[PDB]
Amino acid sequence: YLHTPKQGQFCVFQLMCAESNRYSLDHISSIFTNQETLIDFTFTLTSMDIWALWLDDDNQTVVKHINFEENQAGQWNPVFVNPLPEDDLAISDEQEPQEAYLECLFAPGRFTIAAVQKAIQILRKLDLSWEELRKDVTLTVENEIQNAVIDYDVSQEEFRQINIENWCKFYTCCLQYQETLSRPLALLVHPDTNMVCLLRKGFLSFLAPCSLVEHLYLVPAEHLLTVDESVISD
Amino acid sequence: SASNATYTVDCEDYVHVVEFNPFDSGEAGSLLAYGGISYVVIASCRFQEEDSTVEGIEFKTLKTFHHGERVVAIAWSPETRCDALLPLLRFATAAGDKKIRIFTSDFQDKNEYKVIEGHSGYINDLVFCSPEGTDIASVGDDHTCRIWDLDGKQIAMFILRSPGMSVAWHPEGAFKLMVAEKTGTIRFYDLTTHQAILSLESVQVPLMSADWCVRNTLRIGAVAGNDWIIWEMPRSSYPQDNKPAHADRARMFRWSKCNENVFATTGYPGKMKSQIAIHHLAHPQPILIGTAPVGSGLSWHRRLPLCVVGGYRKLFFWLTEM
Structure with missing residues (x-):
């Protein structure tokens, strides 16, 4: 990988050894890359794919893969990376901010235990169970709310707004720490079983293949005009 | 030690739900x-404690209403006199x-009933959500609380996230309705702005029943799983008191109408006889543990310290000595 200030470029070479112990490089392919900053990349010989992991200009995680032997167009096949939780949680006037925020924080796959634990440790200035972690988050934020409620005569709307503000404070902290723990670090690609994994600083993530319907639905519009029509149907 | 029922009244069939009149007639x-x-x-139930003239219990059937279906819950109207x-x-x-089915009668010939349809799931509990007795709230397994x-x-429909098990009207404060969802999330709904005022949480699941305390409005009692749970407002959503009520499963929670410390929990009709454990807030163990062969339905006497569990073709009355 030849990092240039304008455009990165991949190059796959085959080592050829002549009779006279003279070694030379045979050029197989040359694949250009967008302005994204490369983190790690590895390529297999079973599938002949170049797996590479970048960060775009907004510091989001971008993973792609390309076959370096059947590359007639130079196109990188996308990988649908999971996006970070939303900055704002939209609450209807019928749900309670408490339960909505708890459901959004304790839903499977959204927040890591380490992020919520760090947010608690900071908000307060042991290896707790998830239910005890739920009760502990609720207790810390209930305490912050009772500290922020200064008057005895606070109306229901003002009390609800204070509820939302303190829970959103805690959620923004949890999201900051999940963004820190979600930083991509390197790639692990199994050569024999084609198992691909994206190693992040906080956890480990596996890459599974995608069906045709979801692939057609989720691919960006600019890459949908190049989909091979012989794959969808004869 | 099983406590024998103070009073036992024979009935014509299995009692599926028994409810005293909490209003003065x-x-x-x-x-x-x-x-x-x-x-x-x-x-009509006249007791020895109420009147010395009455020996034991004077049980007099006033009016029999043919329902046609298994009655699962009964709600008295404030206008009953x-x-x-x-x-x-x-x-x-x-x-x-x-x-x-709203049965309106005058105790003499006139008998009227009105079938109200709309629920797509079995109604677990219903109450009159109006001081004047004009509105009736019903919660069911269709995840909805409907005001009729x-x-x-x-009039209004509140979409719940869980099958509503028990609905209760606030004793003093108006326009406040308590809906106890099966996942433990008990919610309070305003009947004017139609919005959720608050949401309490139970540590154990499933929340089978919930009741307000008439004497102390702040104290709310419920039965989740095998343990009874008491909350006290405006303090916290966390259970104040949480002690085991029954070994198999606790089903019905009813507060005493004469005391703010006594409450009765009925065990679930199953492998064991449906036991009743009348607890007391001060005492760690129940003051009275009685056994009913098959018991469904629990209600407290308005003035006396007495509760009733409807057994098989019988009515078991237990007197709690204060």
Whole structure:
């Protein structure tokens, strides 16, 4: 990988050894890359794919893969990376901010235990169970709310707004720490079983293949005009 | 030690739900509505403690209403009166057909009933959500809480996230309705702005029943799983007191109407006889543990320290010595 200030470029070479112990490089392919900053990349010989992991200009995680032997167009096949939780949680006037925020924080796959634990440790200035972690988050934020409620005569709307503000404070902290723990670090690609994994600083993530319907639905519009029509149907 | 029922009254069929009248009717006796397999019997209960003249219990069936379906819950109306000048017998009964039957009578010939349809799931509990007795709230397994007027028209529908198990009207504060969802999330709904005021949480699941304390409005009691749970407001959503009630499963929670510390929890009709454990807030163990062969339905006497569990063709009354 030849990092240039304008455009990165991949190059796959085959080592050829002549009779006279003279070694030379045979050029197989040359694949250009967008302005994204490369983190790690590895390529297999079973599938002949170049797996590479970048960060775009907004510091989001971008993973792609390309076959370096059947590359007639130079196109990188996308990988649908999971996006970070939303900055704002939209609450209807019928749900309670408490339960909505708890459901959004304790839903499977959204927040890591380490992020919520760090947010608690900071908000307060042991290896707790998830239910005890739920009760502990609720207790810390209930305490912050009772500290922020200064008057005895606070109306229901003002009390609800204070509820939302303190829970959103805690959620923004949890999201900051999940963004820190979600930083991509390197790639692990199994050569024999084609198992691909994206190693992040906080956890480990596996890459599974995608069906045709979801692939057609989720691919960006600019890459949908190049989909091979012989794959969808004869 | 199993406590023998102080009073036992023989009935014509298995009692599926027994409910005392929590409102003053104007008569010496306290009304009792027990709903059986296909009927709802209105009766009058005079006790020895209430009147010395009465020896034991004077049980008199006043009016029998053919229901046709298994009565699963009975809600007394505030307008119910036994006044000589103008008698009115109004009550709402939900059944195993997802329908509400409002029986309005005058204790003499006139008998009227109104089927209210709309629920797509079995109604677990229903109450009159109005001080004037104009509105009836019903919670069910369709994840909805519906407010119905006397003419059978839905006024408001609150979408719950769980099957609503128990609905209760706030004793003093108006326009406040407590809905106890099965996942433990008990919610309070305003009946004017139609918005969720607050949401309490139970540590254990499933929340089978919930009741307000008439003497102390702040104290809320419920039965989740095997343990009974007490909350006290405006303090926290966390259980204040949480002690085991029954070994198998606790089903019905009812607060005493004469005392703010006594409450009764009934065990679930299953491998063991449906036991009743009348607990006391001060005492770690129940003050009275009685056994009913098959018991469903629990209600507390308005003035006396006495509770009733409807057994098989019998009514078991237990007196709690204060």
